[PDB]
Design an enzyme around this catalytic site. Structure first.
Site, mmCIF file in Angstrom:
data_model
loop_
_atom_site.group_PDB
_atom_site.id
_atom_site.type_symbol
_atom_site.label_atom_id
_atom_site.label_comp_id
_atom_site.label_asym_id
_atom_site.label_seq_id
_atom_site.Cartn_x
_atom_site.Cartn_y
_atom_site.Cartn_z
ATOM 1 N N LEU A 132 3.656 -0.980 4.978
ATOM 2 C CA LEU A 132 4.761 -1.787 4.484
ATOM 3 C C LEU A 132 6.095 -1.061 4.685
ATOM 4 C CD1 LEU A 132 3.221 -2.807 1.049
ATOM 5 C CD2 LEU A 132 3.353 -4.305 2.971
ATOM 6 N N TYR A 133 6.098 0.251 4.436
ATOM 7 C CA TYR A 133 7.314 1.045 4.532
ATOM 8 C C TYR A 133 7.758 1.426 5.928
ATOM 9 C CZ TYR A 133 9.862 2.432 0.282
ATOM 10 O OH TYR A 133 10.709 2.564 -0.791
ATOM 11 N N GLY A 143 4.804 -4.322 -1.956
ATOM 12 C CA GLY A 143 5.354 -3.005 -2.140
ATOM 13 C C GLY A 143 5.899 -2.709 -3.500
ATOM 14 N N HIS A 191 11.431 0.511 10.751
ATOM 15 C CA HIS A 191 12.188 0.909 11.938
ATOM 16 C C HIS A 191 13.335 -0.065 12.318
ATOM 17 C CE1 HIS A 191 8.832 3.792 12.094
ATOM 18 N NE2 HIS A 191 9.921 4.504 11.991
ATOM 19 N N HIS A 246 9.553 9.966 3.031
ATOM 20 C CA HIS A 246 8.923 11.035 3.824
ATOM 21 C C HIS A 246 8.348 12.224 3.091
ATOM 22 C CE1 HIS A 246 9.385 8.702 7.259
ATOM 23 N NE2 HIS A 246 9.307 9.688 8.135
ATOM 24 N N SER A 300 5.468 0.689 -5.230
ATOM 25 C CA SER A 300 6.719 1.419 -5.455
ATOM 26 C C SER A 300 7.033 1.820 -6.899
ATOM 27 C CB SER A 300 7.922 0.686 -4.840
ATOM 28 O OG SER A 300 9.004 1.573 -4.555
ATOM 29 N N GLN A 360 14.553 6.987 4.759
ATOM 30 C CA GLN A 360 13.723 7.751 5.686
ATOM 31 C C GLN A 360 13.333 9.080 5.037
ATOM 32 O OE1 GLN A 360 13.364 9.264 10.288
ATOM 33 N NE2 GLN A 360 15.394 8.800 9.476
HETATM 34 C C1 HEM Z 1 15.964 8.401 13.906
HETATM 35 C C2 HEM Z 1 15.172 7.417 13.134
HETATM 36 C C3 HEM Z 1 13.792 7.326 13.119
HETATM 37 C C4 HEM Z 1 12.929 7.733 14.068
HETATM 38 C C5 HEM Z 1 13.256 8.358 15.408
HETATM 39 C C6 HEM Z 1 11.605 7.466 13.561
HETATM 40 C C7 HEM Z 1 10.448 7.792 14.222
HETATM 41 C C8 HEM Z 1 9.170 7.660 13.723
HETATM 42 C C9 HEM Z 1 7.992 8.111 14.426
HETATM 43 C C10 HEM Z 1 7.967 8.787 15.796
HETATM 44 C C11 HEM Z 1 6.947 7.913 13.598
HETATM 45 C C12 HEM Z 1 5.506 8.323 13.897
HETATM 46 C C13 HEM Z 1 4.566 7.163 14.318
HETATM 47 C C14 HEM Z 1 3.179 7.646 14.855
HETATM 48 O O1 HEM Z 1 3.137 8.710 15.556
HETATM 49 O O2 HEM Z 1 2.143 6.957 14.580
HETATM 50 C C15 HEM Z 1 7.498 7.345 12.374
HETATM 51 C C16 HEM Z 1 6.767 7.041 11.244
HETATM 52 C C17 HEM Z 1 7.288 6.500 10.097
HETATM 53 N N1 HEM Z 1 8.597 6.126 9.940
HETATM 54 FE FE1 HEM Z 1 10.117 6.519 11.123
HETATM 55 N N2 HEM Z 1 11.637 6.903 12.307
HETATM 56 C C18 HEM Z 1 12.986 6.776 12.046
HETATM 57 C C19 HEM Z 1 13.488 6.112 10.956
HETATM 58 C C20 HEM Z 1 12.717 5.537 9.963
HETATM 59 C C21 HEM Z 1 13.266 4.838 8.830
HETATM 60 C C22 HEM Z 1 14.740 4.648 8.536
HETATM 61 C C23 HEM Z 1 12.239 4.473 8.056
HETATM 62 C C24 HEM Z 1 12.365 3.790 6.865
HETATM 63 C C25 HEM Z 1 11.302 3.625 5.873
HETATM 64 C C26 HEM Z 1 11.033 4.953 8.704
HETATM 65 C C27 HEM Z 1 9.752 4.905 8.154
HETATM 66 C C28 HEM Z 1 8.618 5.481 8.714
HETATM 67 C C29 HEM Z 1 7.320 5.531 8.086
HETATM 68 C C30 HEM Z 1 6.976 5.094 6.675
HETATM 69 C C31 HEM Z 1 6.512 6.178 8.947
HETATM 70 C C32 HEM Z 1 5.115 6.697 8.691
HETATM 71 C C33 HEM Z 1 5.130 8.122 8.146
HETATM 72 C C34 HEM Z 1 3.770 8.757 8.131
HETATM 73 O O3 HEM Z 1 2.819 8.068 7.749
HETATM 74 O O4 HEM Z 1 3.644 9.937 8.519
HETATM 75 N N3 HEM Z 1 11.342 5.604 9.891
HETATM 76 N N4 HEM Z 1 8.869 7.188 12.469
HETATM 77 C C1 LIG Z 2 14.386 -8.565 -2.801
HETATM 78 O O1 LIG Z 2 13.783 -8.173 -4.037
HETATM 79 C C2 LIG Z 2 13.152 -6.902 -4.110
HETATM 80 C C3 LIG Z 2 12.967 -6.090 -2.932
HETATM 81 C C4 LIG Z 2 12.341 -4.808 -3.051
HETATM 82 C C5 LIG Z 2 11.897 -4.334 -4.340
HETATM 83 C C6 LIG Z 2 12.080 -5.134 -5.485
HETATM 84 C C7 LIG Z 2 12.703 -6.413 -5.371
HETATM 85 C C8 LIG Z 2 11.498 -4.333 -6.636
HETATM 86 C C9 LIG Z 2 11.476 -4.719 -8.147
HETATM 87 C C10 LIG Z 2 11.108 -6.188 -8.376
HETATM 88 O O2 LIG Z 2 10.727 -6.891 -7.470
HETATM 89 O O3 LIG Z 2 11.194 -6.692 -9.552
HETATM 90 C C11 LIG Z 2 11.045 -3.183 -6.133
HETATM 91 C C12 LIG Z 2 10.399 -2.122 -6.942
HETATM 92 N N1 LIG Z 2 11.258 -3.113 -4.789
HETATM 93 C C13 LIG Z 2 11.011 -2.041 -4.050
HETATM 94 O O4 LIG Z 2 11.521 -0.995 -4.397
HETATM 95 C C14 LIG Z 2 10.146 -2.074 -2.803
HETATM 96 C C15 LIG Z 2 10.214 -1.002 -1.890
HETATM 97 C C16 LIG Z 2 9.423 -0.986 -0.724
HETATM 98 C C17 LIG Z 2 8.568 -2.013 -0.458
HETATM 99 CL CL1 LIG Z 2 7.549 -1.941 0.929
HETATM 100 C C18 LIG Z 2 8.490 -3.087 -1.347
HETATM 101 C C19 LIG Z 2 9.288 -3.117 -2.535
#
Ligand code: HEM
Ligand SMILES: COc1ccc2c(c1)c(CC(=O)O)c(C)n2C(=O)c1ccc(Cl)cc1
Ligand code: HEM
Ligand SMILES: COc1ccc2c(c1)c(CC(=O)O)c(C)n2C(=O)c1ccc(Cl)cc1
Ligand SMILES: *[C@@H]1O[C@H](CO)[C@@H](O)[C@H](O)[C@H]1NC(C)=O
Ligand SMILES: *[C@@H]1O[C@H](CO)[C@@H](O)[C@H](O)[C@H]1NC(C)=O
Ligand SMILES: *[C@@H]1O[C@H](CO)[C@@H](O)[C@H](O)[C@H]1NC(C)=O
Ligand SMILES: *[C@@H]1O[C@H](CO)[C@@H](O)[C@H](O)[C@H]1NC(C)=O
Ligand SMILES: *[C@@H]1O[C@H](CO)[C@@H](O)[C@H](O)[C@H]1NC(C)=O
Ligand SMILES: *[C@@H]1O[C@H](CO)[C@@H](O)[C@H](O)[C@H]1NC(C)=O
EC number: 1.14.99.1
Lengths: 552, 552
Positions: B353-354, B495, B357, B176, B499, B172
């Protein structure tokens, strides 16, 4: 105090203060080892004992014409040759960038703050005994004394290569999209965040600006018609902010795109030809795309002109400047199997090198009337007077001064030349010799060696005393031109890398970008691949006033 | 109306409207020819008839452990293997970038306006019959209906791979710095102009901000001591703007760097460990450089942490996420003989992709107390309560949900999941199948094929009807996970490229940057080359609470 003040690290290694009075050289990848990255690796000896000096090659390039003409007709060979010029040259610049006005070290700031001009050689530690680090006296010779004794012009020395005014002004226009010192912040800070050939000087620095200059009809830029002639729209109309002396009657305060191209009609000339060129492409792209709309016609047009620009600058401009019998080529493909960074950051040193004020004659003779600097400056009626065609013909026929050689700086732009000296100094520059070293060039062992004569040579010696301590900017102008040429080894050797990396390190050259469709079709793509300063004029000036960057 | 609406151009060629009802495909460099860049070049046939499918390779990677361990001990081999993963993966993204929210075509604006997230696949023409271009009904299934029918969680499905909370929150925190949607402008616009691992989330988005977070003593960031513990300084002190609910008693309104890391203690935990890490390096660098000053200690420290970050993310984070027996390696040299663009632009698709949640459990169990989302949210006393060590121990031991698979979205962040659906829609996204095609994957022939079961599969079918017309985001979550894995082929395949390019396409990886001196010495360089999530914690938490991204 800085134990690195003495620029102790040779062959490109990095110097680092490992304790108050201790330093260490990071000879990584230099190809040398030892305390000062001085002792070469065995395979490095080999290379050394095999590399033709700049002059050697420069000779062979400017000679053997008959041989060359054969080569120019064996594509494969030409391609292989050009391919080699791109890579070697380009390999001389750091991409991504390192160092700047403030950063003598790499730092994330130095790297990302796009408001700085990057720096090929780090500055000098503010805590170094002498300005050039350690060598020399507590101060460099008074600028005014160098300006006058070896820079200023007495007798107009013409360019032995033929550079006319079409060239002088094209180079003023062209480089002015990337050199745009932000004087608000100081030298070392640029206002051209695009750092390259983005044609910001035609379309504007910013979106808000470009939208003021656009017509929003068929992708065209706004324009006006005086006589039956097309001209840039006014500041009063588009509302764009331009720099113009208050006495200018409006109606002559042209808009264009670069806020300073109204201070010199040579610029407004080209400012107008490209405006003409943009539109010309729009109509062409509209003829192919009845279904396209404004923004697509525009964005595509702005992409074609970038290609022409790069095209023209390599095969006409640079070609000419080189005087090589070998035909230089703009072919983005040459690098498709090469390792190459399609990115770039304009460096201070390039800005300095590109200070070509000596190209300027003493009067601007526009067919039948000759003008004093004072009369030409920000006088657009002159453009409106004779009007392009008779401007193109005049300028095609009017040599420009020799840059290198000595004493050729017009006393008019002498405030400028001194300013250059002064600023390079404030931007903590390093010695001409260090820079020479930086570009695999062998350092000068004497002012006498630098100039190629002794009048100025000894004259400079009296000022700088130690040759090493001699400054980069002055030296460029007061330098032995190679034969009947406008520049000397230093100027070519330091700029060619900066120049090809910024020309070739552009997105439109990247494989994703370099394809017919990127430009509207095989039709638009050709507009790029068949560009020329002759066509640029032919297609946009009243009759096809023949031109060239050579005064015949 | 757009004759390209139908996405007619296969195998990567570009589509172009050559007339109102006509189109043309630019199969340049695709390796195919013909109307739709469909018919392969003979040498392309070869490659096709030799490419192991993702699953094939995924198998061989996650199997043959004994063989693999031998490999992992034959450097040369591992290096060659890793070298191959970097290049192939990376070769999937466009650098320089092309297309964005507004640009279905290349354009200089699309290219240079750093305020946009770039786009791997152009948007859909605003004048296309159906949202997915031409296929499907006048509209996609009501988001609320997909959210509920196949996305929302009933029974908490744990991650079959062992992802604990250290990982969930690391991911997260980590992503971020690059995903920071600028909601002022709209989805598709980012606030992270650095587009990568710049640690803007530790040091601040801008200079003015970082300077407020700095101590200006030994290159250290400002901090405070609660208990005998180091903690981020407050907003009231540094004066940096953070996003906190008004009821928060100040004194807990931590500063940190990313203006949103106060809304979740898992973030503030990591916000604090890195703050701790920064300083830790400063002291180390001062120990080697008695002569260095603040800004140099700082600028170098911020360079070492970027290396650690990239290190940890490759060999710990990604390593684990892959479950490969092969030891992934962070070695910037692997690419020193390869063609590689040390640049990057975060794309919308990667942001989507990322959206992990589903990693979130239903309660945040911090040793002895369990918390409701509502209780945990922007509650920093919890951090101050148990304090890092007992937070690290808790989180090391607490599985995270399975991402792929189906119905695992916490009903809490359900506003979020729908939001994703809604926005991908407004950002004119393309079908999951087009994206699949985009990444050399074979498209799904049925919802049934997608899910790997029929309860949801048919359930989705009732909604999207035509499999093609199925959306990218939902499909990622409602997708047959590869064996005991957290994701399915789509998520990995799309990804991993994004990535590795953003990880390896960083200046510190470039040859000019990748050297001992760039970081303060062989000492600083090692701090990078021996980084680990374990050490990250070991050197910055009270005892060395053992950790990992795996819940044992
Ligand atoms: C306490 C935990 C978490 C809360 C409450 C939370 C909450 C949120 C909220 C409210 C949004 C905004 C969505 C919108 O307004 O359109 C968001 C976006 C996002 N969250 Fe989380 N999230 C949490 C954990 C995570 C985790 C663990 C990931 C793991 C990758 C994650 C990835 C994302 C991503 C990539 C976005 C978009 C960021 C951006 O484009 O600004 N979140 N999340
Ligand atoms: C189960 O097997 C995996 C899973 C995730 C992987 C990789 C391999 C590799 C390397 C590889 O596949 O050789 C990379 C670089 N990964 C990432 O970090 C990644 C992170 C976020 C998204 Cl959304 C997608 C991929
Ligand atoms: C009518 C002709 C010209 C005039 C009156 C002129 C005038 C000037 C002036 C006044 C400056 C500002 C210096 C300072 O304040 O520090 C300048 C800068 C510059 N000029 Fe010219 N110049 C002319 C032609 C040219 C030409 C033909 C070239 C060819 C390359 C050139 C290259 C430069 C460069 C590179 C700079 C620095 C730009 C920057 O950093 O902002 N000039 N010139
Ligand atoms: C006389 O012979 C020359 C002169 C200039 C040249 C080159 C060769 C080459 C190519 C080559 O030398 O092989 C390049 C790229 N030049 C430039 O464009 C250039 C532009 C501005 C400055 Cl300040 C310095 C150089
Ligand atoms: C490095 O240079 C210093 C002086 O600049 C000199 O004392 C030393 O011997 C040199 N060592 C090498 C290996 O060049
Ligand atoms: C670049 O750096 C200078 C000094 O560090 C600073 O004043 C300026 O605001 C910075 N510019 C940007 C765009 O951050
Ligand atoms: C980027 O695009 C948006 C919308 O087109 C615009 O408001 C913003 O000013 C642009 N940024 C730049 C630096 O041009
Ligand atoms: C500008 O040039 C024109 C034409 O040579 C001339 O009539 C006019 O006097 C000049 N303007 C000024 C202010 O000298
Ligand atoms: C290309 O697609 C069009 C319709 O989208 C079809 O008429 C044509 O035959 C196709 N050709 C190939 C080679 O796929
Ligand atoms: C936040 O956590 C603290 C300490 O565990 C607790 O006193 C408080 O009730 C929590 N806040 C809310 C709104 O539950």
């Amino acid at each position: 105090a800085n134990p690195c003040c003495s620029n102790p690290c040779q062959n490109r290694g990095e110097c680092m203060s490992t304790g108050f009075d201790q330093y260490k050289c990071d000879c990584t990848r230099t190809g040398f080892y030892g305390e000062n990255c001085t002792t070469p690796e065995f395979l490095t000896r080999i290379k050394l004992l095999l590399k033709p000096t700049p002059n050697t090659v420069h000779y062979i390039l400017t000679h053997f014409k008959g041989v060359w003409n054969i080569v120019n007709n064996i594509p494969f060979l030409r391609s292989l040759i050009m391919k080699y010029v791109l890579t070697s040259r380009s390999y001389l610049i750091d991409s991504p960038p390192t160092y700047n006005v403030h950063y003598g070290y790499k730092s994330w700031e130095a790297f990302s703050n796009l408001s700085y001009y990057t720096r090929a050689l780090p500055p000098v530690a503010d805590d170094c005994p002498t300005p050039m680090g350690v060598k020399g006296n507590k101060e460099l010779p008074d600028s005014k004394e160098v300006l006058e004794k070896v820079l200023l012009r007495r007798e107009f020395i013409p360019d032995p290569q033929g550079s006319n005014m079409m060239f002088a002004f094209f180079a003023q226009h062209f480089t002015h999209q990337f050199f745009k010192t932000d004087h608000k912040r100081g030298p070392g800070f640029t206002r051209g965040l695009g750092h390259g050939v983005d044609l910001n000087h035609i379309y504007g620095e910013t979106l808000d600006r470009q939208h003021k200059l656009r017509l929003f009809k068929d992708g065209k830029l706004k324009y006006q018609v005086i006589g039956g002639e097309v001209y840039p729209p006014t500041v009063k109309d588009t509302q764009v902010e331009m720099i113009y002396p208050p006495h200018i009657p409006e109606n002559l305060q042209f808009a264009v795109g670069q806020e300073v191209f109204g201070l010199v009609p040579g610029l407004m000339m080209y400012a107008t030809i490209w405006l003409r060129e943009h539109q010309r492409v729009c109509d062409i792209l509209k003829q192919e795309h009845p279904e396209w709309g404004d923004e697509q016609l525009f964005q595509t047009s702005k992409l074609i002109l970038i290609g022409e620009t790069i095209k023209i600058v390599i095969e006409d401009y640079v070609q000419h400047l080189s005087g090589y019998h070998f035909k230089l080529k703009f072919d983005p493909e040459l690098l498709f199997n090469q390792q190459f960074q399609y990115q770039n950051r304009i460096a201070s040193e390039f800005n300095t090198l590109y200070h070509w004020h000596p190209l300027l004659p003493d009067t601007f003779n526009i067919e039948d009337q000759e003008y004093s600097f004072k009369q030409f400056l920000y006088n657009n009626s002159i453009l409106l007077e004779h009007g392009l065609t008779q401007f193109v013909e005049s300028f095609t026929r009017q040599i420009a001064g020799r840059v290198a050689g000595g004493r050729n700086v017009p006393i008019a732009v002498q405030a400028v030349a001194k300013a250059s000296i002064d600023q390079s100094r404030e931007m903590k520059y390093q010695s001409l010799n260090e820079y020479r070293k930086r570009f695999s060039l062998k350092p000068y062992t004497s002012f006498e060696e630098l100039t190629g004569e002794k009048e100025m040579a000894a004259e400079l010696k009296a000022l700088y005393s130690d040759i090493d301590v001699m400054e980069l900017y002055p030296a460029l102008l007061v330098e032995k031109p190679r034969p009947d040429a406008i520049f000397g080894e230093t100027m070519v050797e330091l700029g060619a890398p900066f120049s090809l990396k910024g020309l070739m390190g552009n997105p439109i050259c990247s494989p994703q970008y370099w394809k017919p469709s990127t430009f509207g079709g095989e039709v638009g793509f050709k507009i790029i691949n068949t560009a020329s300063i002759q066509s640029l004029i032919c297609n946009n000036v009243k009759g096809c006033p023949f031109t060239s960057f050579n005064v015949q």
